[PDB]
Design a protein around this ligand. Sequence first.
Ligand code: NAG
Ligand code: NAG
Length: 192
Amino acid sequence: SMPAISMPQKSFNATAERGEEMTFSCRASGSPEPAISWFRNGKLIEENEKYILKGSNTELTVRNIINSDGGPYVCRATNKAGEDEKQAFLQVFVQPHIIQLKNETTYENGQVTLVCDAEGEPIPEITWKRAVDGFTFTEGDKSLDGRIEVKGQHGSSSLHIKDVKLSDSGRYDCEAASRIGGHQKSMYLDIE
Ligand SMILES: *[C@@H]1O[C@H](CO)[C@@H](O)[C@H](O)[C@H]1NC(C)=O
Ligand SMILES: *[C@@H]1O[C@H](CO)[C@@H](O)[C@H](O)[C@H]1NC(C)=O
């Protein structure tokens, strides 16, 4: 009888660069006993440190998950009567990481833009925090006096200050956060 594959789980999530591993399983009914084998990118998966195969190839463990591990892994079952193929799929998430947060200067009575840029999957939300008083800015938000405004989209945010004052100087933090976690970095605004 032709091989018929069963899978407990077919879609999987993992987070990159955390030393995580996941195990895909593939079993098949059929006579004669179907032989199970796994493919990635169309090439047979051979056992090593990264890929662990157990239970006559019924279980595939991918170790030390990184972004490039994302995608389809194909389970093939074959016997003299025919073959069946099914895919397991791995979505790899990436925790937020701020990749750009520069220091800035401007002069009193001037204008300045603080820029924070972050990577991540999901795309992180960006929040700004003013060190001296711990006041936080999201969105969208603006200051009571209307001088400060936050605009941002797609994991990037600008904090814009109009009519700078000496007291605006000091540390500002960017916080990039997703369900996965968060990353915070600091820069320094010098009004001088
Ligand atoms: C994988 O993550 C996605 C996106 O958050 C979620 O919708 C899905 O249910 C997850 N799959 C799991 C863990 O079963
Ligand atoms: C901002 O803070 C000081 C300025 O003296 C410096 O040590 C630090 O590297 C600056 N940050 C950047 C990204 O230039």
